[PDB]
């Protein structure tokens, strides 16, 4: 599934995203515009033979099992293809354990360079929520 803007802003919240840990819901859309554009179904291969998997991108090496990431971990206890759901929510819960690892959001490559001192509640402006 391809979310709207809103639309994923207020399923994010509703699952307990907004402020978690201290990231408001703009900072949560901004990372999913530019990890997936918003696509449930995106896969991307990395050059360690890890892929990463759904609207947040999260990645084989540690969070969740693809049967071909050797020596990987699974910290969420998930197969990866569930990630790839029109439901976010085994997204958004693993997503919850990644930002509470110590590193904050810059596990997202695309939240540190493109999301980052910028004005992000931009990404919320005008929905209903
Ligand atoms: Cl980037
Ligand atoms: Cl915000
Ligand atoms: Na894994
Ligand atoms: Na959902």
Same mark, same amino acid.
């Given at each position: 599934? =391809?979310?709207?803007?809103?639309?994923?802003?207020?399923?994010?919240?509703?699952? /307990? &995203? *907004? $402020?978690?840990?201290?990231?408001?819901?703009? $900072?949560? =859309?901004?990372?999913a515009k530019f990890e997936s554009n918003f696509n449930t179904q995106a896969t991307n291969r990395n050059t360690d033979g890890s892929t990463d998997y759904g609207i947040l991108q999260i990645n084989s090496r540690w969070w969740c099992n693809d049967g071909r990431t050797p020596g990987s971990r699974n910290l969420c206890n998930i197969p990866? +293809? !569930? &990630?790839?759901?029109? *439901?976010?929510? !085994? +997204? =958004? $819960?693993?997503?919850?354990?990644?930002? +509470? *690892? /110590? @590193? /904050?959001? @810059?596990?997202?490559? !695309?939240?540190? @360079?493109?999301?980052? /001192?910028?004005?992000?509640?931009a990404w919320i402006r005008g929905c209903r929520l």
């Open positions: 599934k =391809v979310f709207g803007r809103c639309e994923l802003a207020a399923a994010m919240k509703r699952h /307990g &995203l *907004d $402020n978690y840990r201290g990231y408001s819901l703009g $900072n949560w =859309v901004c990372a990866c +293809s !569930a &990630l790839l759901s029109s *439901d976010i929510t !085994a +997204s =958004v $819960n693993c997503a919850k354990k990644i930002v +509470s *690892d /110590g @590193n /904050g959001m @810059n596990a997202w490559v !695309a939240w540190r @360079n493109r999301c980052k /001192g910028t004005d992000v509640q």
